[PDB]
Symmetry: C3
């Protein structure tokens, strides 16, 4: 009996009944211990003796053995115990080797990480993906991962190692073709990695989430080619209530917090500091296998960010046989700023970017039905390269309502570069343009419409303070066609502006262009006492449907017309009043209107 | 000693002291095992031998025994172990029998569901409510359920069984008269049920929540009368971060995700696919016992939905002795679309519906102080039956600001049908009207004001693209009274429209009606050289306070007035200018204005 | 052997191997029991015998012993067992004694509170802070607390005791200089306390959160000086999805739910009832040591509140050597109401308050770049002291877009009192002004601009119903300078108003003031048949750049001008038309415009 009791089967001979309840199961101690499982149950030598973790012990095979066994019983939760650091020191084998995998995840096997998991210097300068849910080196031939959750108060620490080569890939958790999988509560820190977590594979997967995680200092070298902390590559998936921080200079040029790359995905309630970018919202044709060619129902909401480049980047692209489409997006409630930096020291600052594809093409995109509403954006006054929207590729629609943008440009695209075709750009009068960059805008147009064409668009400009440094509120080069559009410049704070709206190709004459903006006009009357016509000297007003005074009349003996219409020769004309006769000559600020 | 050790009291004789710490309690193994409890501790035959769960074992009595016992000790958490499916195969007894109850929940007893709970075919074609928190067949005589939480990574599977009769009810969790109760993390799937979860009872309860749950395929037959996945019937309660999906055709006609039926309730951050409806926000008089007659502080926010009917439905109704009121509602940040379907193939598509009561009455409602802001809505171009708001019953107020609606109608109600009395309908100019349905609107009015009366309302129409197919932007039949209102149609994209605003009863003449909209007007001048009057041919402008040109003047020898006022006979009149004399005749596009 | 087995080392001699797996560690029962730890493991007398908790047992030393021991092993989670109430009955010792501390928290030691923790009457009328993370009486000399989480379904009950003196402080959890600490799921109830939870210390700390907690009835006496349920005094920290309720009358005058006092902090998705205030968003100079002098990236979003005073209070202040600044704030998606109360029975009701410092100074603040968007506010019609914004101290900017405010005042500040200097106040036309207080406003100005000066501001007034009781829509006293501003009053529902906008110092004449508002004007024409001038009788219109008719013309034989400009003597003048000659005299409603 003593022998049995001291043997590994001893607990299986000690009887137990819950709280001495006579109606409860007569069990053995081992049965109750068998209800939970930890790494300690597999972290042993060939003779079954427990091995202490530490920097000179590779815990990988033990952890894999745990996962494999629990998988065999239909699943469960393995605890990685608190108060210990568990080092990983070799690559895994089989299907995950194609993915430089360390640990293979398996369906229904959750990890409750309370302790710390730390990479050993075996991985210095090498690729790695710490946890991998694919079961095949080729993801297309991989089975699925289902019902796998990683959670706890613990830590995945990437050991600080730099990348060995830019072409290398590194990841924390790749769930694979992942259905009902999640990461909750975990801190990922101290690396130079490509991603911390990836969800799904080219649209295959569903209901994957990252919640209440922290990601701290995950880029550290110039070798790192590119970093996106969470890539969401399956639908009905998202990121909520996370914290993302970088301190590296390199992160300000390369790192993004989230990629939303399939339909019905979201990014909410998170805080970001030290990153180049906030989120991509993208349909890559190359990734359309699992869930279709459309990214729709895309939500970026209630985030806080200090970034150095662009907050939300929109795009879609094509392959030889597939075309990607992006539609039905909402960006709302976010408060974002470009952090302190020199002008042009990082990628061009923006709230929204319409980004050309990875080859630079701006004529492949099919982006539409986007609503950008109730956001704040700020950039410091020196950051010339800051815009509410950098509109650098074809756009089929984007709607701005009730935002507050306080940066250098409202709408921008660089001249010379791409010439996007623009449709359904709506900038509602309820967008408030801040004043931080007042006096900085010499030579610049607030809305610099450097496009091939604009159609079915609305730009309602409303200033909230003066900025007499700007060349114009809005300017269209002669190369930009403009049709079936509404372009207005509210008069407030514009009295002293030389140019308000500028149409370098006189595009405001178009049949279906609806405009209004202030201008100064010289007029001269006839001599006649009484009701008397005033006519503009210039003849550039053939497009004007009505105009009205924005100036007081300092005279007693006459008054100019309150309102004007035009004449076939391009003059304005209205009827004023000469109390006493005489030819009058006045220079008046008018609101020019066309079909409005 | 050997006998004691092998007995069910053996663990109570093996000493233990935590980590060999001399300051720790000298305990027995059984004490430490007694700190947790699982179904295995009650899942045993009369001789105390453990019984394996499976399809031919009814786990119900064992689970009830666990709950009952733990209840007796002041509560705790029972685990339902992972890696096992636990079948339920009979009805419960006593107080829950009135509710077709299987398991009775008890206060302070939490269930940590890690495994799967599955209904056996005993329940095929029968009613059932799996977990029930009432303790009496009559809910009015029921005690409360308090501090009961169901959580975990497991699954409640309803076995796929269809309803036997439409009158049957089926539920997953009925918390009852429920205070501080919740469901977190659980997947409900594979049924034909009425509800998955219900919270509270007719206003009794508080602080009940459903968080991070999934609801998958919970309608499957034509027998199912009606389905609402979560019913929230107690205050200070809500639904957050959940996932709702249906695949059945029947779900598109019958199923709703959430009912918010008491004050201080919310529905946020959730994704819905395949449902008819998103949420009801309702005060039923019949349900006002526990928390009063007012549903206020109702929040629907930051959800993603593809539905087939209406997203948010507002209502309130009355009984012989109680009147229900709905006020102080916010609907914001939601991105919603009507899924691909034929016109009229499901209930009429809408973002907001003002729904008549269950008997069809439209004159019982008291709905007011609603804010609908910063939402997106889309319906495909063929879906004739799509509206920003279907306003089908009396409305005492609803405010729309800064939404983006892209569907067939903005405001709609069917003619012939109900004639709602409308007050305080506010449609701010910052609502962007999309263009998906451009060219589809022959015979239709964008804002079809098919009401008994409208008062204290604002409709500011702003197009963003042309749609010359529409009969009018806004139309009031002669049967609709209109007073103390503002109705404007911005001119942009309307130059070629025959009708902009239409008042079939000439209601725009009312003393306290403030309007403006474009119109084409024929004018003829007197002969006089110099300042010369132009007068409209028609005499239908007695209501007009001013009008101004929206057309250019192609002439050299004269110009029409820039502006006009009226004359008692209904003509317009203004002063233009004949450089040379002669009677002039022109047809001009004017902005007609009344008291604006 | 029997002796060993019955000894406290007995479990260390019973072998166990997980599920009889031959590849698993050969362990001893004690090893597996050692994987978890509870209060029962320390809740024992000097002889190691377990002691039952209860009202006459002080559990404090036992709980401290547990925390201390687990701390010694690098951390872990101590469970406070369900089904027991654990009373605390004495003060702690050492470093926490300076903080009236009961229990000292330690790094990496989590508490899983499933049972109830209750204060014994030893604490009646005494200060206390139940859990304290400082390790020194002087917080400046304190070490940090890291990785400390308190979570569970249990309860901290403050025993109902009143404060003994107003100067006393009481707290639930003070995390101290706290990094990666949180409270989740816990109910705090039944006290008279200063705070329930405090996070950080004067900017030191990071990543501290309070989530899914309840706070119930935490003020109960007139002695209580001040109450704020959660104070957030470290960056990258916040409050989400919590419930706050008070029932005391005193709470309506003293209690606030949240203080956000450092950068990158948030308050979201919470419900508040019975409180005076919702949140302070503040930079106290006195608290700038740990994270700088700027509070930026401040987010208050998607909350539900019934309060009696002010919802969000903004401020910043200075010390002898430090100046605090507040910028980059977003307040959105909140639905708030002032609960039923008499006028002036609690602190003045407001959605936003710009509050003077604790000494009453209104000239120390540096508050700017605030966006208040997509919120609802309501106050009952009798509550005279209700405002969208009480603007009581210097303001460097605040932007309102697309809110719905339904209360007595829009903008208010009491006359006589403070004279704030106001810059960059933007009130967009998309703010909807409700009608609840229509007919209550005798003697009152809707926008009562009781400031020293206003600059670079926009007030676009839009009514949605009539309120002829109000003295004016907007009024500027002569003492308020006004420059570089836009002030408009839309005409809708104003026809019958005697005063619309009132400039008691004729400030609308300023060179860079842009205004428009309705007025009634008497005009008289010359005799001349044909085109004929009309001139105002009054000469108060020297500032007017144009005016246009808002009235119909009931006459046949003539018409007044549609539009007007001015003359140097301050008259208006326009050209109408006498079909037949004669001097005309008319009283017309005009839209007066200046530079707009
Ligand atoms: C860091 C990051 O994610 N950046 C975004 C861009 O991602 C694109 O580049 C990445 C560079 O790291 C990825 O490519 C790299 O990795 C590929 C995948 O690795 C293979 O497959 C894995 C499943 C295995 O485990 C690996 O062992 C390996 O075999 C590899 O094929 C590439 O050669 C390599 O460079 C990223 O690739 C995606 O990664 C996810 C997550 O792991 C995976 O689920 C996908 O299957 C995989 N996709 C593809 C096509 O391989 C690759 O997409 C991203 O393109 C960009 C979006 O913005 C641009 O495009 C927009 C749309 O046109 C445009 O609007 C915008 O302006 C553009 O800048 O955003 C980040 O830069
Ligand atoms: C599926 C669903 O919930 N639909 C919504 C409507 O709910 C209404 O019909 C339901 C049909 O299933 C419910 O009625 C059914 O159930 C009743 C309750 O069951 C009894 O009581 C339980 C406590 C016991 O456990 C049961 O054993 C049983 O005894 C039963 O009395 C009815 O006879 C039966 O048809 C639903 O009833 C509510 O259910 C909740 C949750 O279980 C419960 O807490 C309530 O006490 C109970 N209420 C009542 C009054 O019984 C019943 O409300 C819902 O009416 C509708 C709202 O929209 C309509 O009304 C709006 C306001 O006028 C109007 O704006 C809109 O246009 C209308 O369509 O939304 C769903 O259809
Ligand atoms: C209840 C509450 O928090 N009210 C808010 C105001 O807080 C200010 O008053 C509080 C009164 O309780 C606090 O002061 C009290 O406590 C101080 C701290 O206790 C000391 O230090 C602790 C760390 C130890 O554990 C204690 O043992 C003790 O030694 C004490 O020094 C004060 O003497 C006492 O009155 C509150 O103090 C802060 O407390 C937090 C949390 O514990 C702590 O992290 C801070 O270090 C500590 N700060 C300071 C400076 O001591 C104190 O701040 C708050 O001022 C107000 C904001 O609104 C006003 O100011 C705005 C900006 O000018 C203005 O816009 C607005 O209109 C004003 O009303 O909001 C609440 O009233
Ligand atoms: Na690979
Ligand atoms: Na849009
Ligand atoms: Na071009
Ligand atoms: Na029943
Ligand atoms: Na409203
Ligand atoms: Na009628
Ligand atoms: Na102190
Ligand atoms: Na602002
Ligand atoms: Na002054």
């Amino acid at each position: 009996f003593r022998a049995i009791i001291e043997s590994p089967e001893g607990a299986g001979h000690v009887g137990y009944q819950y709280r001495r309840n006579t109606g409860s199961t007569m069990r053995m101690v081992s049965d109750v211990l068998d209800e939970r499982v930890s790494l300690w149950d597999f972290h042993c030598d060939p003779s079954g003796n427990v091995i202490q973790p530490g920097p000179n012990v590779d815990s990988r095979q033990y952890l894999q053995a745990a996962i494999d066994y629990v998988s065999s019983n239909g699943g469960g939760t393995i605890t990685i115990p608190a108060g210990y650091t568990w080092y990983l020191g070799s690559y895994g084998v089989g299907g995950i080797a194609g993915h430089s995998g360390i640990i293979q995840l398996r369906s229904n096997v959750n990890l409750n990480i309370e302790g710390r998991i730390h990479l050993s210097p075996f991985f210095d300068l090498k690729p790695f993906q710490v946890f991998v849910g694919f079961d095949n080196g080729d993801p297309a031939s991989s089975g699925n991962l289902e019902n796998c959750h990683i959670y706890g108060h613990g830590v995945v620490d990437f050991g600080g190692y730099e990348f060995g080569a830019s072409s290398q890939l590194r990841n924390g958790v790749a769930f694979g073709r992942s259905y009902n999988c999640s990461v909750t509560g975990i801190t990922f820190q101290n690396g130079d990695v490509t991603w911390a977590i990836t969800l799904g594979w080219n649209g295959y997967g569903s209901n994957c989430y990252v919640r209440k995680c922290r990601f701290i200092n995950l880029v550290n070298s110039s070798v790192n080619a590119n970093h996106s902390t969470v890539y969401v590559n399956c639908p009905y998936s998202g990121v909520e209530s996370c914290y993302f921080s970088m301190s590296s200079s390199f992160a300000r040029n390369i790192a993004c917090s989230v990629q939303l790359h399939q339909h019905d995905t979201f990014y909410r309630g998170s805080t970001v500091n030290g990153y180049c970018r906030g989120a991509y919202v993208v349909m890559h044709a190359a990734e359309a296998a699992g869930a279709g060619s459309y990214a729709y129902n895309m939500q970026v909401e209630n985030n806080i960010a200090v970034i150095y480049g662009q907050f939300v980047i929109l795009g879609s692209d094509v392959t030889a046989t597939v075309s990607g489409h992006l539609n039905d997006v909402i960006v709302s409630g976010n408060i974002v700023s470009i952090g302190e930096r020199a002008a042009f020291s990082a990628p061009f600052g923006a709230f929204i970017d319409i980004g050309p594809d990875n080859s630079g093409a701006s004529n492949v995109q099919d982006i539409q039905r986007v609503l950008v509403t109730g956001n704040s954006f700020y950039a410091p006054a020196n950051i010339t390269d800051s815009a509410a929207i950098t509109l650098r590729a074809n756009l089929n629609g984007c709607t701005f309502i009730a935002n507050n943008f306080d940066c250098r440009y409202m709408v921008y695209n660089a001249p010379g570069t791409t010439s996007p075709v623009v449709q359904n750009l709506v900038w509602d009068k309820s967008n408030v343009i801040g004043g931080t960059h007042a006096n900085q805008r010499a030579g610049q147009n607030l809305f610099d419409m450097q496009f091939a064409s604009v159609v079915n668009s609305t730009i309602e400009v409303q200033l909230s303070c003066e900025d007499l440094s700007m060349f114009s509120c809005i300017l269209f080069p002669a190369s930009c066609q403009l049709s079936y559009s509404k372009i207005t410049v509210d008069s407030a704070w514009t009295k002293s502006m030389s140019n308000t709206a500028v149409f370098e190709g006189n595009q405001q004459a178009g049949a279906n262009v609806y405009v209004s903006y202030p201008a100064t006009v010289n007029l001269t009357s006839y001599n006649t006492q009484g009701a008397v016509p005033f006519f503009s000297t210039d003849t550039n007003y053939a497009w004007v449907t009505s105009a009205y005074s924005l100036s007081i009349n300092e005279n007693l003996d006459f008054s100019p017309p309150a309102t004007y219409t035009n004449k076939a020769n391009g003059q304005l004309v209205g009827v004023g009043y000469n109390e006493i006769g005489g030819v009058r000559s006045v220079s008046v600020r008018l609101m020019l209107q066309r079909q409005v």
